[PDB]
Amino acid sequence: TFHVDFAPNTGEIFAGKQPGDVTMFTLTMGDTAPHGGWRLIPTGDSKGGYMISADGDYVGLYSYMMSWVGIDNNWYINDDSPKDIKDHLYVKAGTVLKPTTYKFTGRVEEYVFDNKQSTVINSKDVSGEVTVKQGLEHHHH
């Protein structure tokens, strides 16, 4: 019953200084069965909550619905509802993007609370790449 859908967004991302907050990825997750909440752990090179250019540049991602705990290295939201959670990760206006591909890896865990603690009852590794286009080339001689 545990389902996860992590996907990059489609088309129209332009290299340069973003004029607004821009979704890079979207995440949909849900469960009818009893649960405590959800985290997304940014894994590997995404550790710290980042996207990674094949070149090696890191870009900071934010979560619209979840909160970030640096110490634990995850985004979480506590939710018990059997309703679908629709989050996405985005970069903040003013972020400079480069006309390249950016990877994101991490792991999505569902959890439970029995009294004092959380345990992982379900998990899914997730990844995604997002390709940023150049607009017009600009040639100055």
Binding mask 54-73 for ligand GAL (x = CB under 6 A): ---------------x--x-
- Smallest separation, CB 37 to ligand GAL (Å): 6
Question: Using CA atoms, how far apart are residues 110 and 37, in angstroms rounded to an integer?
Answer: 6
Exactly one of 39, 61, 106, 108 binds ligand GAL (CB under 6 A); that residue is 39
Q: Under rule CB under 6 A, how many of the chain's residues touch ligand GAL?
A: 8
Q: How far is Cα 26 from Cα 90, in angstroms, rounded to an integer?
A: 9
- The breaks in the chain (C to N more than 2.5 Å) occur after none
Residue 76 interacts with ligand GAL (CB under 6 A): yes or no: yes
Please state the closest distance from residue 31 (CB atom) to ligand GAL, in A. Answer: 16
- Binding track over 97-116 against ligand GAL, x by CB under 6 A: --------------------
State how far the Cα of 98 lies from the Cα of 96, in Å rounded to an integer.
Answer: 7
Look-up: residue for tokens 């970069």?
A: 91
Does residue number 74 form part of the binding site for ligand GAL (CB under 6 A)?
Answer: yes
- Give the three-state DSSP class for 118: strand
